[PDB]
Amino acid sequence: ARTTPIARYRNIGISAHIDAGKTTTTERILFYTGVNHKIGEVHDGAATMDWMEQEQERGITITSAATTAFWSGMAKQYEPHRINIIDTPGHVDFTIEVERSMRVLDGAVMVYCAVGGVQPQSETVWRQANKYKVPRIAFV
RNA sequence: GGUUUAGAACGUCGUGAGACAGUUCGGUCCCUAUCUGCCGUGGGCGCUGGAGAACUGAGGGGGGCUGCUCCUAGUACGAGA
Numbered sequence: 232a233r234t235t236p237i238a239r240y241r242n243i244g245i246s247a248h249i250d251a252g253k254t255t256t257t258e259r260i261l262f263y264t265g266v267n268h269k270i271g272e273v274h275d276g277a278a279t280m281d282w283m284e285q286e287q288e289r290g291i292t293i294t295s296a297a298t299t300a301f302w303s304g305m306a307k308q309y310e311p312h313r314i315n316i317i318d319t320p321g322h323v324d325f326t327i328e329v330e331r332s333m334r335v336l337d338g339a340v341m342v343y344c345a346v347g348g349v350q351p352q353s354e355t356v357w358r359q360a361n362k363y364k365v366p367r368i369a370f371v
Numbered sequence: 372g373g374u375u376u377a378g379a380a381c382g383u384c385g386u387g388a389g390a391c392a393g394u395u396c397g398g399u400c401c402c403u404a405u406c407u408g409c410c411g412u413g414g415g416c417g418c419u420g421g422a423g424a425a426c427u428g429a430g431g432g433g434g435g436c437u438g439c440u441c442c443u444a445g446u447a448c449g450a451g452a
């Protein structure tokens with residue numbers, strides 16, 4: 232019946248300020264879980280998550296897209312876990328898209344830039360996570 | 372080709388010959404370079420015995436243009452765009 236045990240289920244989000252690396256990291260994820268053959272890049276318009284024509288041209292993610300993957304581990308330590316990743320926009324123009332997605336997700340990976348780190352949308356998403364009380368980790 | 376010759380016509384002006392910052396069709400453009408100038412190219416003598424060569428370099432000239440793509444770098448700046 233159930234393909235993967237519920238314990239081997241991660242529902243995660245990638246919310247962060249604009250150009251924090253949220254979309255690129257999902258591409259590196261789709262690469263290091265083998266689900267995507269090419270690493271890709273947003274400026275080239277290559278990123279899969281940005282499927283919308285506008286998102287390709289502007290490089291912006293104007294919608295949240297959800298994808299899943301199986302990362303057994305870095306040493307194949309665990310049986311493959313199905314990570315449900317909901318990549319989100321960080322443009323305050325689209326704020327529902329992060330919150331619409333946020334209640335559903337069980338955990339949050341909040342990206343930050345090493346040059347800037349907390350930048351204004353970053354506080355905005357932090358506040359959103361606190362309202363849905365997602366337990367959080369961070370990728371700088 | 373135009374402009375302003377001789378032909379012809381139109382509109383207009385004049386009685387007319389003709390004329391018009393009116394138009395229209397047609398209508399012959401010569402010169403073997405003496406001098407300067409310039410581009411090349413030599414002959415003479417000179418540079419202090421004659422010759423063969425290799426140079427130095429005053430000075431003179433030539434040349435000096437730029438696009439696009441990628442890279443730095445989606446980096447600086449920018450809440451973003």
Ligand SMILES: Nc1nc2c(ncn2[C@@H]2O[C@H](COP(=O)(O)OP(=O)(O)O)[C@@H](O)[C@H]2O)c(=O)[nH]1
Nearest residue numbers: 248249250251252253254255256273274292445
């Ligand atoms: N230098 C550098 N650039 C990165 C890194 N991660 C992402 N980027 C660039 O940041 C820009 C925007 O990243 P993206 O993930 O589209 O931004 P987001 O969609 O707003 O998270 C893209 O040009 C990426 O190439 C990184 O680790 N280093």
Ligand SMILES: [Mg+2]
Nearest residue numbers: 250289290291
């Ligand atoms: Mg951009």
Ligand SMILES: [Mg+2]
Nearest residue numbers: 253254291292
């Ligand atoms: Mg994005």
Ligand SMILES: [Mg+2]
Nearest residue numbers: 372373374398
């Ligand atoms: Mg003529």
Ligand SMILES: [Mg+2]
Nearest residue numbers: 376377378398
């Ligand atoms: Mg005659």
Ligand SMILES: [Mg+2]
Nearest residue numbers: 376377378379
């Ligand atoms: Mg006549």
Ligand SMILES: [Mg+2]
Nearest residue numbers: 399400401402
């Ligand atoms: Mg002649």
Ligand SMILES: [Mg+2]
Nearest residue numbers: 431432433434
């Ligand atoms: Mg010179």
Ligand SMILES: [Mg+2]
Nearest residue numbers: 432433434435
């Ligand atoms: Mg010169």
Ligand SMILES: [Mg+2]
Nearest residue numbers: 274275444445
């Ligand atoms: Mg670039």
Ligand SMILES: [Mg+2]
Nearest residue numbers: 288289290452
């Ligand atoms: Mg625009």
